[model samples]
Target: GDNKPPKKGPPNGCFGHKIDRIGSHSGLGCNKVDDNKG
Candidate 1:
């Protein structure tokens, strides 16, 4: 799968509502969760 995320959504709470995947990390990869922003 290379460096890409798992086939399914994120296992942690970083799950996104649109892409349905984790978007955060220990580096500058600042990803956000679902519309949960609101």
Candidate 2:
């Protein structure tokens, strides 16, 4: 049972999940997430 997301598209990277800033408790750093607009 190899059920998973469609692999039609090549794997680029874990977008929007990266912690760009975590110092001084400044908060999270926003990033791209598949056509995200936040």
Candidate 3:
């Protein structure tokens, strides 16, 4: 499935942790956050 935008938190914030970048695609692509607590 395609990547979906994170859901809103209870207080009206992002449910996922804020991530400036992922893998090695920093600076080249957009920064994304994930809700997975792994």
Candidate 4:
């Protein structure tokens, strides 16, 4: 039983994930948001 989907998603916060919509960041937000906007 090793076939499992990788743990995909913000573990703690949104790291500027591949947003399906809105798709915007102003260098302000949580862990993921800070990933690129920090």
Candidate 5:
């Protein structure tokens, strides 16, 4: 295949993807938390 979606993890080299939903972390960066203080 010539076109396709990139991987969604450390293999993809992506980082700092976080939320109160689906959080992820990479080798260069880490995940964070986004929630209420209640």
Candidate 6:
């Protein structure tokens, strides 16, 4: 079996296999978000 435990599920159900694409993409609407005053 070669250790097994790999496939999470993605045969055409629409989930993109729980896409991660590397780590840390920032937070708070990305890039801290200042938006100049209220």
- Summed backbone clashes in each candidate are 0, 0, 0, 3, 0, 0
Q: Residue 3 error for model 3, in Å? A: 11
Best by lDDT: 1
Model 4 accuracy (lDDT, Cα): 0.37
Residue-wise C-alpha lDDT for candidate 2, range 1-38, written one tens digit per residue = 13322223335543233344343433232345666575
Expressed as tens digits, the lDDT of each residue in 1-38 for candidate 3 is 02544434435443444343353322222224354433
After superposing candidate 6 on the true structure, give the runs of residues whose Cα lies further than 4 Å from its correct spot: 1-10, 21-38
Model 4 agreement with the true structure over 1-38: per-residue lDDT tens digits: 13322234656664434343343332222434444453
* lDDT over C-alpha atoms for residue 37 of model 6: 35
Relative to the true structure, how large is the alpha-carbon lDDT of every model? 0.40, 0.37, 0.36, 0.37, 0.36, 0.34
In candidate 4, stretches whose alpha carbon ends up further than 4 angstroms from where it belongs are 1-9, 23-38
TM-score, candidate 4, is: 0.16
lDDT by residue (tens digit), candidate 1, 1-38: 23544444545544333443444441222365555643
Cα miss at 10, model 4 (Å)?
A: 2.3
RMSD of each: 9.3, 11.8, 10.2, 10.2, 9.0, 11.6
Pairs in steric clash, model 6: none
* Model 3 stretches with alpha carbons more than 4 Å out: 1-4, 7-14, 20-38
Candidate 2, after superposition: displacement of residue 28 in Å?
A: 0.7
lDDT digits (tens) for residues 1-38 of candidate 5: 12322235454445433322332332322444465533
Model 4's number of clashes is 3
Number of clashing pairs, model 3? Answer: 0
TM-score of each: 0.15, 0.17, 0.17, 0.16, 0.15, 0.17
